[PDB]
Design a protein around this nucleic acid. Structure first.
Lengths: 125, 222, 55, 134, 49
RNA sequence: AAGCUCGUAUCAGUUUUAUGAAUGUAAGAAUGAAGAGCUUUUAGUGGGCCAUUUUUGGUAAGC
RNA sequence: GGAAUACUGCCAGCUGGGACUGAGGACUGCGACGUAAGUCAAGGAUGCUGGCAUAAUGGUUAUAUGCCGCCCGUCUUGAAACACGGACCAAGGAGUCUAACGUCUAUGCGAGUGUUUGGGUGUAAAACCCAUACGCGUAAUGAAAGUGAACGUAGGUUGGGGCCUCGCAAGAGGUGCACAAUCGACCGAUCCUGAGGAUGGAUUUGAGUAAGAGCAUAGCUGUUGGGACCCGAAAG
RNA sequence: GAAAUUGUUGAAAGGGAAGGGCAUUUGAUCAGACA
């Protein structure tokens, strides 16, 4: 489906301050609550923070590079929901679905023309 | 259904009629400006021929451009700049010259560069940086119907009628000027000329009255 | 303090009666001091005499 | 000023939905006051007794008017004779419903009123005593 | 949807101000004027020097 | 934050004119603004350091 | 004497080069040209053409290079600074529950309201029914004894969302809800009038009557008491 | 059968600090579209 070119604004990950220094501090983002932090007062040369200016374009939000919204699917009955919306959404076979059932979902999605984002998942020969 | 082309054609006839009225008004304004400046020239020549001196009619219109930032300003002038709608730096407005307005200018001299505008500058300001306050909502001009819809109450019906009310400071100057959203000018194209901006224009700076060189200044800012 | 207001309202009462008793362009509002109009000033007797810091 | 009511009642949401349509379209100052009154709280809409409606019909040149209450209509024991009119409200207390029907008149909803008076014609809006309570 | 400036883009210049056609036709900015012979008097010349 | 009014002519760290012994009033002066008033109640807050301009005292000089 | 030109200012004068940008998505509008049909640079980019079709985009990543970049937390104060905590990792680890009273909101019923002390019943700590009372409210005032809220269409005047009649509209008038101010009628205790305490006279009191508004449950939450945000004290 | 912490193997860097941000080269590695 016709979509605009995707502009991300911030490709990088917003890592927590001193997450790379200490091992006990996770890389998962937290705001520096302290009043004397040079990160909170956004000094020159300090890490960039998540703020609403970095918001992605609404017409190209949640879209994979192919211009498709990813949609998790467990089985045939849930895949059959995207019959009408083939160029908007693309199927994502859930991680816990067995190798026996993935071949069922892939064949059925080929028949209805619904795109699967992850083939080759549990498809060893 | 009917009305598909009938009301359309009648509307087009009304458009043509309204346009023709604007045309003859513009021709009348053009001839007015031309004969006015010719009268100033000829009266000057006649004064020299008589061995006399002709003073010009004192200017009744200034354009004021903010020169300084928002900070380290005393409140006495800081209130004045809000009253002349000079909210940010390089924002410009037209001011009618009275005794009441001239002292307002004297309070804010270190913070603005003002002078007397020509027709050419006002024409270029309104054509390029022309924006209207329609209930709020800084509307771009682009169409004469947009001017007439708001200011048809005060006669004005096109873009040049509005310019006419600005330069020939008229009975409805307040409404045309306040209708015009304060002009948002870029920094001057050729630079400011001076090394230090915050000296008086007479002593190698930018601020204060420059009287005629505001035309050179604002046309580069535009 | 408001010594001028009552007097100018009395003047407004005089100029409203004058408004009704004439084909009128009213103008009861005070207009601030205007820019000076153009005039041809003649130098026939009154010659433009020079000066300088001589001193 | 309020966008969506604090109420979780789906039927009150439907009446709000109905009067948002009528208040923006019909440009009559009836619907704007009615739709304003539905956004109010419980303490801000005190109940209108059947006694106050009785007063509003004793009112001069206000006999055959359709009375509108946007709160709830409550029963009263102090009155003995009640006129024959149509009362529109959200809820009627079982006693007041009985009293209005026994007198001969009708007790209608607010959407029923919206069909009968879309521009809010021949109507009268009563609100209950506020600063009387603390 | 977008602000077309007059001065450049002559089409929107003609959208506003229908006189622009006539102004351009007669030239009306490069308009010549008739000359007179009103010579300055002796007083003005002597006081200039 | 909540309710009730008017969304206005309710006004403004501003100028003018007039009234007065850099401050005082009024305006059917200017310019600017659509965030106005009235109840009800609910957090936090109750230090100062530096500099400029007036002004009174000071002295080797600072002050 | 007759010219040129500089400087200054205007042209809705013409003609090149360079950069960044292309947002929107059937049609509406304003225009221009055209004898008209039609066209257009006029309500935001289309037309043509080529290489690749994978590591060539790009990403992640280790490093190199140019430029930037104090060590966090706490606690002080007007500041900075000291000072105090911090060898590293995992897991644990601090505004919780309840009682009482209160605001706001939601919900049920409404001059009433609350089943769950109990009883009946039950597919059994669930759910579903309920007699008698009780609680708070529907009446207050006074120290108590005691007395106890309509002269009027529940009152006059001043405003007042709405609605109604006229208005081709603006506007005028009638009606006036809630509510706000002021002058009154009744209840209560408070003195003259002398009918013993009568008819009438004037205020003071009240979180009064003046045609009720509350009761109950739930949620956010506040105050106070509990170990009461978590760890620590010179002990009797 | 995590991390701290250590060994081996492979890559890389290292003239009185290191880790961090913007941008790119280089080396490593990876995603679709061509169903």
């Amino acid at each position: 489906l016709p979509h605009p070119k995707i502009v991300k604004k911030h490709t990088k990950k917003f890592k927590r301050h001193h997450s790379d220094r200490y091992h006990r501090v996770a890389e998962n983002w937290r705001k520096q609550k302290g009043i004397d932090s040079v990160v909170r007062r956004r000094f020159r040369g300090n890490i960039s923070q998540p703020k609403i200016g970095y918001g992605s374009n609404k017409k190209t939000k949640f879209l994979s590079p192919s211009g498709h919204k990813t949609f998790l699917v467990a089985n045939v009955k849930d895949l059959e929901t995207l019959t009408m919306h083939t160029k908007t959404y693309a199927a994502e076979i859930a991680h816990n679905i067995s190798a026996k059932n993935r071949v069922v979902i892939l064949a059925r999605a080929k028949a209805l023309g619904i795109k699967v984002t992850n083939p080759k998942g549990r498809l060893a020969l | 259904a009917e009305q598909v082309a009938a009301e359309r054609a009648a509307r087009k006839a009304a458009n043509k009629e309204k346009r023709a009225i604007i045309l003859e008004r513009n021709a009348a304004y053009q001839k007015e400006y031309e004969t006015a400046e010719r009268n100033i020239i000829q009266a000057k020549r006649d004064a020299k021929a008589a061995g006399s001196y002709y003073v010009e009619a004192q200017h009744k219109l200034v354009f004021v451009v903010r020169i300084k930032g928002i900070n380290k300003i005393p409140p006495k002038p800081r209130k004045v700049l809000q009253l002349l709608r000079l909210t940010r730096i390089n924002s410009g407005t037209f001011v009618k010259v009275t005794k009441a307005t001239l002292e307002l200018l004297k309070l804010i001299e270190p913070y603005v560069a003002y002078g007397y505008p020509s027709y050419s500058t006002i024409r270029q300001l309104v054509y390029k940086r022309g924006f209207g306050k329609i209930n709020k909502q800084r509307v771009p001009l682009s169409d004469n119907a947009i001017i007439e819809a708001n200011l048809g109450k005060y006669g004005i019906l096109s873009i040049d009628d509005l310019i006419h009310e600005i330069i020939t400071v008229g009975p409805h100057f307040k409404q045309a000027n306040n209708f015009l959203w304060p002009f948002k000018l870029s920094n001057p194209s050729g630079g400011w000329g001076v090394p230090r901006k915050f000296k008086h224009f007479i002593q190698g700076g930018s601020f204060g009255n420059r009287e005629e060189f505001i035309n050179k200044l604002v046309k580069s800012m535009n | 303090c408001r010594q001028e207001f009552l007097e100018r309202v009395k003047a407004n009462a005089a100029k409203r009666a004058e408004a009704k008793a004439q084909g009128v362009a009213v103008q009861l509002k005070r207009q601030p001091a205007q820019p000076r109009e153009s005039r041809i000033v003649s130098t026939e007797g009154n010659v433009p005499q020079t000066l300088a810091p001589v001193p | 000023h309020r966008t969506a009511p604090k109420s979780d009642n789906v039927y009150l949401k439907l009446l709000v939905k109905l009067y948002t349509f009528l208040a923006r379209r019909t440009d009559a100052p009836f619907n704007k006051v009615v739709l304003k009154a539905l956004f109010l709280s419980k303490i801000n809409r005190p109940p209108v007794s059947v006694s106050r409606i009785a007063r509003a019909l004793k009112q001069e040149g206000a006999a055959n008017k359709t009375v509108v209450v946007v709160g709830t209509v409550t029963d009263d024991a102090r009155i003995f004779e009640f006129p024959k009119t149509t009362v529109a409200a959200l809820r009627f207390t079982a006693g007041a419903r009985a009293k209005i029907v026994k007198a001969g008149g009708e007790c209608i909803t607010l959407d029923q009123l919206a069909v009968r008076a879309p521009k809010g014609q021949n109507t009268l809006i009563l609100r209950g005593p506020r600063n009387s309570r603390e | 949807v977008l602000k077309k400036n007059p001065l450049k883009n002559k089409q929107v210049l003609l959208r506003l101000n229908p006189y622009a056609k006539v102004f351009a036709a007669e030239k009306l900015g490069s308009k010549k004027a008739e000359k007179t012979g009103t010579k300055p008097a002796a007083v003005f010349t002597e006081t200039l020097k």
